[PDB]
């Protein structure tokens, strides 16, 4: 079985700038490589193959060279249809072997979360159970950390994130923080808060509610 | 004028089975390699199977041997995957894929296969109301399988909506939210209805999102 590792796993750049990734393969495979690229959601669409050759469509900016176990992919110029991830494979013996993949995303400058809070809407507190949910929107670096307070007590455990792509209009992230309750534990408590640090904020941020509001 | 179109993907339990089928047009489907290819909800591209233009060779993953057979029909210009004894790691989305000078030269849509245990499940759709810009949005809470879809205002409100990735609870099944900021001064001018479909269980809700 031959191994295909990529390098680097994720990088960010800024449209126009030029990007190369790398692929190392456990044994020789002469330049019988091929990349691929795929954006979120999306079916793959190749790109190279016999390891430097353009396939049909694929503008001029893309190249790839190497030979045996040294492969590279470069972008001389990234525009907004080139953030996406890149796959290298090896068709020289099976199995075909697929690397896992370097994630190519946009750098911009730094932005902060707006921070919003949503206790349980009347709907679902009337069916036994509660959900809590703190949104972040639109902040860059992906970086974040969102501390939940019931009755000003640290929770752990009992929240789950979720973090959508990058945004393809302003390169931005937004995330969810939900807070899973009983209905019954839920209503024990009295003041929520979710708390939001980000290199963007100066300050951290926390927005509350009291539940009977 | 290349098109291919698979189907035949579901949910399943472990232990079941699934034949799936991709038809190919727009190329001379019986002079080249085809293959399957594979991808789990989170992770990379993984090679299946692949079968030789006259049929008369086929390779497989080593963890599908026996258990899966790739085969085509030139009468029809279609291949066929044939899945039994499904684990949960069979789970993914399957793509049909011909070799040119290259493996996997055009790809279709794919098609979703989900083998679990957990039963069908529609979701429960909750407002998350506004009270600058402000911000709404709507839970969608404790479903299964994979997917829904959730739109605002039948596709009109399309600038700053954000629908975040589903993620699995606790209890095994999946729950999300999406959320849209609009300007606050809209609030009363703007009527805000949030659309989710979940096919699998065939469950269509529809909710306006007030204060």
């Known amino acids: 079985d031959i191994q295909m590792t990529q390098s680097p796993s994720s990088l960010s750049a800024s449209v126009g700038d030029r990007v190369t990734i790398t692929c190392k393969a456990s044994?020789?495979?002469?330049?019988?490589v091929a990349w691929y690229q795929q954006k979120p959601g999306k079916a793959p669409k190749t790109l190279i193959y016999?390891?430097?050759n353009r396939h049909t469509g694929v503008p001029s900016r893309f190249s790839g060279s190497g030979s045996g176990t040294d492969f590279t992919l470069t972008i001389s110029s990234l525009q907004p249809e080139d953030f996406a991830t890149y796959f290298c494979?090896?068709?020289?013996?099976?199995?075909?072997?697929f690397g896992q993949g370097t994630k190519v995303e946009i750098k911009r400058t730094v932005a902060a979360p707006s921070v919003f809070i949503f206790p349980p809407s009347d709907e679902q507190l009337k069916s036994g159970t509660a959900s809590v949910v703190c949104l972040l929107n639109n902040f860059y670096p992906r970086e974040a950390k969102v501390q939940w307070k019931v009755d000003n007590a640290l929770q752990s455990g009992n929240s789950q994130e979720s973090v959508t792509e990058q945004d393809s209009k302003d390169s931005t992230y937004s995330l969810s923080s939900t807070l899973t309750l009983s209905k019954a534990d839920y209503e024990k408590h009295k003041v929520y808060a979710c708390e939001v640090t980000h290199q963007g904020l100066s300050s951290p941020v926390t927005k509350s509610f009291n539940r009977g509001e | 004028e290349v098109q291919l179109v698979e189907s035949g993907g579901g949910l399943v339990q472990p232990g079941g089975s699934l034949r799936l089928s991709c038809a190919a047009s727009?190329?001379?489907?019986?002079?080249?390699?085809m293959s399957w290819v594979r991808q789990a909800p989170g992770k990379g591209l993984e090679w299946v199977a692949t079968?030789?233009?006259?049929?008369?060779?086929?390779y497989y993953l080593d963890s599908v041997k026996g258990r899966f057979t790739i085969s085509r029909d030139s009468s029809k210009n279609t291949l066929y995957l044939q899945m039994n004894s499904l684990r949960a790691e069979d789970t993914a989305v399957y793509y049909c894929?011909?070799?040119?000078?290259?493996?996997?030269?055009?790809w279709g849509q794919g098609t979703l296969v989900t083998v679990s245990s957990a039963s069908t499940k529609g979701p429960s759709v909750f407002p998350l109301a506004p009270s600058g810009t402000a911000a709404l949005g709507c839970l969608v809470k404790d479903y299964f399988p994979e997917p829904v879809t959730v739109s605002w205002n039948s596709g009109a409100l399309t600038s700053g909506v954000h629908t975040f990735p589903a993620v699995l609870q606790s209890s095994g099944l999946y729950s999300l939210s999406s959320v849209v900021t609009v300007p606050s001064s809209s609030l009363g001018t703007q009527t805000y209805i949030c659309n989710v479909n979940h096919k699998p269980s065939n469950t269509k809700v529809d909710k306006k999102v007030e204060p």
């Open positions: 494979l090896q068709h020289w013996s099976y199995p075909l072997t």
């Open positions: 016999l390891a430097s």
């Open positions: 894929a011909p070799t040119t000078v290259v493996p996997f030269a055009y």
């Open positions: 079968i030789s233009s006259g049929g008369s060779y086929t």
């Open positions: 727009g190329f001379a489907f019986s002079t080249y390699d």
């Open positions: 044994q020789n495979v002469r330049t019988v």
